[PDB]
Amino acid sequence: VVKEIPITHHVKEGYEKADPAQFELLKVLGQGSFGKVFLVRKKTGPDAGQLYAMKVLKKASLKVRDDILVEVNHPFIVKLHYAFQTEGKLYLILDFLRGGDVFTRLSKEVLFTEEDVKFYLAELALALDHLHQLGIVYRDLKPENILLDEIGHIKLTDFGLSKESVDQEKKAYSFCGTVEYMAPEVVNRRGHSQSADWWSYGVLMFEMLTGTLPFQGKDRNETMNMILKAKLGMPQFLSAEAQSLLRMLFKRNPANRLGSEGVEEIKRHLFFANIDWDKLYKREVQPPFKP
Ligand SMILES: Nc1ncnc2c1ncn2[C@@H]1O[C@H](COP(=O)(O)OP(=O)(O)NP(=O)(O)O)[C@@H](O)[C@H]1O
Ligand SMILES: Nc1ncnc2c1ncn2[C@@H]1O[C@H](COP(=O)(O)OP(=O)(O)NP(=O)(O)O)[C@@H](O)[C@H]1O
Numbered sequence: 001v002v003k004e005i006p007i008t009h010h011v012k013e014g015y016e017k018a019d020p021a022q023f024e025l026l027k028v029l030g031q032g033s034f035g036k037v038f039l040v041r042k043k044t045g046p047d048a049g050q051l052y053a054m055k056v057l058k059k060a061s062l063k064v065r066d067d068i069l070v071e072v073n074h075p076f077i078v079k080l081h082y083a084f085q086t087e088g089k090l091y092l093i094l095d096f097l098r099g100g101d102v103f104t105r106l107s108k109e110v111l112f113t114e115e116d117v118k119f120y121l122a123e124l125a126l127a128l129d130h131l132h133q134l135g136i137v138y139r140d141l142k143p144e145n146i147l148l149d150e151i152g153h154i155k156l157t158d159f160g161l162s163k164e165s166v167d168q169e170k171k172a173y174s175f176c177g178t179v180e181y182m183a184p185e186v187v188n189r190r191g192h193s194q195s196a197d198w199w200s201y202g203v204l205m206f207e208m209l210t211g212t213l214p215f216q217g218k219d220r221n222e223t224m225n226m227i228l229k230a231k232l233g234m235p236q237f238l239s240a241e242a243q244s245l246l247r248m249l250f251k252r253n254p255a256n257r258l259g260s261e262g263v264e265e266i267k268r269h270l271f272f273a274n275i276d277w278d279k280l281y282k283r284e285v286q287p288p289f290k291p
């Protein structure tokens with residue numbers, strides 16, 4: 001059963017309960033549809049002076065199939081250090097990623113290879129499948145959530161949290177996730193699934209390898225009509241393996257799509273042939289670009 005577990009409290013193993021006064025505000029790290037992410041410094045405690053990223057929400061819950069904030073930890077997913085509730089607000093204290101997002105780093109290159117993208121896509125695959133094994137769907141996957149650490153290893157900004165903004169204005173008009181990366185069944189309000197994450201994954205791959213989105217229109221309904229019905233030519237400058245992976249990921253019907261049964265059929269793909277997956281998971285594979 002899809003179970004909603006509300007996030008009200010969390011203190012990392014071996015540390016003390018936190019409160020907003022223990023955090024000094026330094027800068028705005030950015031702004032997303034669930035609000036701004038700020039940069040804060042721990043003023044007191046064993047980790048005093050250390051930098052963290054702070055998200056401020058009204059509330060956040062986690063939908064899991066069949067402690068969990070400890071299980072979601074992954075080499076390529078941000079770590080939840082603190083979490084607390086004051087004045088109807090939920091503060092989340094996470095890792096501060098110093099590399100910025102990936103697309104920004106790619107645009108700092110005149111050119112890149114299929115291998116460079118393959119690295120990031122691989123680590124991303126590990127993260128996604130790890131979330132799926134816990135029974136978690138990432139719901140809203142988009143480049144803005146894919147950042148780099150100081151070294152260049154992938155780090156996601158979230159782990160499938162169902163969040164709620166504090167801005168009453170915007171949140172009253174808030175509408176789910178990002179349409180460009182929506183799966184055809186998600187567009188059809190059939191509900192999110194594991195396979196939709198892999199559709200979005202395929203859209204990310206396409207966007208990285210082409211620099212363009214496969215489906216985008218003048219508005220939401222046109223983009224959706226495109227995702228559902230429009231034609232999509234295969235970029236002939238891609239390797240056979242890449243074309244294969246894209247062809248297998250882009251399936252409008254899930255359970256006909258790659259990864260609907262396991263990521264093992266994604267790990268074995270000829271596109272990921274020279275990828276040592278355990279060394280990848282151990283962050284022992286040298287990243288293509290330093291942030
Ligand atoms: N842990 C982090 N460390 C450093 N910068 C971060 C971190 N998390 C987010 N950012 C920055 O903050 C901006 C928005 O982050 P994000 O995590 O997407 O906010 P959000 O609440 O998830 N809104 P949304 O992007 O719509 O889901 C991005 O431009 C990032 O550069
Ligand atoms: N862990 C999960 N496993 C399976 N299905 C899920 C899971 N989490 C959510 N869903 C499905 O996705 C839907 C959740 O979206 P819903 O709450 O109806 O509106 P929504 O705005 O699209 N959700 P959200 O993106 O979190 O704001 C439900 O209809 C579920 O069937």
Ligand SMILES: [Zn+2]
Nearest residue numbers: 139176177192
């Ligand atoms: Zn949704």
